[PDB]
């Protein structure tokens, strides 16, 4: 007897909301970079890998009322990256592994620092926006650094503030 | 002594079968949507997030013999979504949280209702099929609704019938 | 010790085969059309966007033996499009969104219908072939239709038969 | 008084080791396949579900010294699957349930048999490897087999040997 | 048994609509410029690359009723470019990289500024229109700027308004 | 007579609280790593398994007021791992079993030591944080160490302090 | 009270390094080929599909010092493909499925063999390089081979060595 539906399914929903004037798509909120396979000799020669796109897209920004009512806050943003750093460099990410290598993220004519400090303010427009960042791998600048024929793995976190 | 296999492993299998003329891949049977991070101000301004794909793929439908022998049942389907709804709206999903926000799923020129009722019949073809649905987040239409700077979480269920 | 290959990689392969006399390249099997950004006023004035190419290339058809042994089946094909349609029009695709707009695909001196029915038979030759189709956006012919300043999204499916 | 650590935690570790020349990741050692929801009519028509990936990845194989010192054993492997089988077929897995259905796993141009016997030897390379297998569901080939509108459940085990 | 269509395929559709009097083809909405390979010495000598076409085509403008009913708004448009800029220059795009180079986009007898401000109003006609822009690479005007033998990468965004 | 509820259920709740500025999810507070099945020969050759993720996520950190009022304590943390160690190495976990193998956990450009001592201070940001750690298995560095074809099992504990 | 960052995000990094003189982009390290839908009759007639690009790009090769110090090793490479093969052919990939079909990859005036053996040495230059390979589908050369109207699926692996 008991009736059986010809197709049962379920969908769930998740998200969050902040006081920001602009929204952040999950696709950019988190992400991962793969540098594939690198030549030791190349890195040992002080070489550097090709830049990877760490671009961050901002959506539904409508910073009109925002930049108006908030006065000085005229539609700029900045990021504060945090992670293990190479001593005396800061802008050099101390990857997790048994290698003498490191990762450097760059923004415009500046470098990214992973010491939790904020970077330069970035002007943005109404509606949609995107920040452009590049990441490369090189032999660490640490003293006595040496490239080990192993795997790479590193994690960096950042906060975004609006002005 | 006792011999030891050089690699032992195990694989299990699960599934089910119904009287439907078409099969449903697990990948669509259940799923989850993440709206990432939203701007309060934007939602408070009555704004709405970008559409998310809740598409449902149907496989091995071969509705030939089906639509023939079953007469009036000429190869259409419909969904009956069920969940908490906002009063006097029904098509507005009453998310679980301390926020004045809600989720609306849309199908074609119509909206989805989560009151357990069936939607419009949808013509399908032989072999493979897919239904197209979109989901967005907005400030709830509830009286006195207000957007709280917190997290979002909601669950909706649906049945699928064949005609 | 353990030796490490100087470059490891992997390639996978996928596809399928049917009783058709001609093969179908993946590039045409599935595809997507982007109409960019449209003027509301223009659409509201009953205007229509520019035609997009939905051409379908068929390869390795060699319909010699085919059209011979299969008699009446003298090297023609037809498509059966399926999707949400505007009532009383059928040839008008009921896009998914909160807009009063729709999509119309056209073939030769005829229009495409998304009710799952087959279109006109199309003569083809030996070796290589291609069908030519155009798609445009317009204000829906639905009663009380009105263009909303939002996004567009629609999905249509079709089967191909050989005669 | 008594001091309280500001965050206490614990991590455990498990695994095993064999005389194999190559290691086996847990992720492949065990696993599970879900075929979602199937059409009875389709199965009753003698239809068959889509192939599921039962691929087995082997890591750190370095079969150099191995294939050398072990002579005839020139870097091949094979699997011996074990489970309930359909009589007179063997390569057909007798699922556990009140349905007239069964599961068939396939490897290359051959089928997998669950009678505890070993399959064909598979050449592998140094470093990393992976075997490719597919699984499908069909109406059992058993005499008088009939598809019951219920659930599916089956378990199969296998050993891996190196040559 | 189960019937198999001789060719199954799927096509999707995307786009959006705004209150603009004219439509914008996707082909211009987004795009990319490649300056190929440049001579360091040349750039170091203060040289400048050849102009690249960043032209923006507007379609279905029919600004008749528009320019009429909207009075002062007599069929002109302007762009507001946004991106990283070189200090004290603004019209000089601070590319992302370890080079002392920059990009300058020019329009008519004026230069483009990437500070989010709007440029000069541009008269347009009924039906079809196109704006003409050029882009060149030069050694940055930044203090102490120097050309590094590396790669170039930059992203700029803009909004379009109608008057 | 006696009435019977149509569904009785019960839910319990557990947890704890410390003076830490940040909270610790149970999911990270405790956890377990499985290295699956390893090759003896590989380990005997001095090989090492692939890195496993022992990442520790910290939530609701809001270290604003914290890092302020606590002066020198400017938002850093460190871990003190404790367990059986291999003599003269310390950073090598003396697993429990009849094998000549051991486990090494690594953090950034440093290794983890299980002698109860604290590791390097790790800068963290406001809101959410995560530490990245890797674990591998190798043939123990103990004198006369030899890999036995058996099972692996080890337990390590750690405390977390905030500065 | 507790402060909430206006946008939190996280990025991870992965990769590896080998003793190779040249680096390998992930995009080529792994990949997948789709042959779309094929005609049975065509394959049965001994026909063959169109060639697919399996090109492998090598980056940052700088084989100057390499080819010098390593003497005989004057800047050549070769691949060793491994997978299921058709008996007495080797260069014919025994796809996984219930079809009488197979895949053949070709390089220059030679064919690729999936028996784990190395192919011909390929001269490469300094900086950037790319190898060109084609893949096609045909009716298997196996005895009694016959094309089944089903799906295709195959996996092949290879190592890269430098001389």
Residue numbers in the entry:
A (entry chain A), B (entry chain H), C (entry chain F), D (entry chain I), E (entry chain E), F (entry chain J), ...: 1 to 163
From the study:
In a crucial step toward being able to test the various putative roles that the pilus rod has in driving translocation and in mediating mechanical resistance to external forces, we solved the 3.8 Å resolution structure of the P pilus rod using cryoelectron microscopy (cryo-EM). P pilus rods were produced in vitro from the purified PapD:PapA complex. The P pilus rod forms a helical filament of 3.28 subunits per turn, a pitch of 25.2 Å, and diameter of ∼81 Å. It contains a continuous central hollow lumen of ∼21 Å in diameter. Strikingly, each subunit makes protein-protein interactions with ten other subunits, five preceding (−5 to −1) and five succeeding (+1 to +5). The subunit-subunit interactions network within the pilus rod is strikingly large, with each subunit burying 45.5% of its total surface area. From residues 1–5, the very N-terminal end of PapA makes extensive stabilizing subunit-subunit contacts. This portion of PapA extends parallel to the rod axis and is termed the “staple” because of the multiple interfaces it makes with other subunits (see below). The sequence after the Nte (from residue 20) forms the pilin fold, a fold previously characterized as a C-terminally truncated Ig-fold-lacking strand G. Compared to the structure of PapA in dimers (representing a state of PapA prior to incorporation in the rod), the structure of PapA in the rod has undergone a substantial conformational change in the region between strands βB and βC, where contacts with an adjacent subunit stabilize an extended region into a three-turn α-helix, αA3.
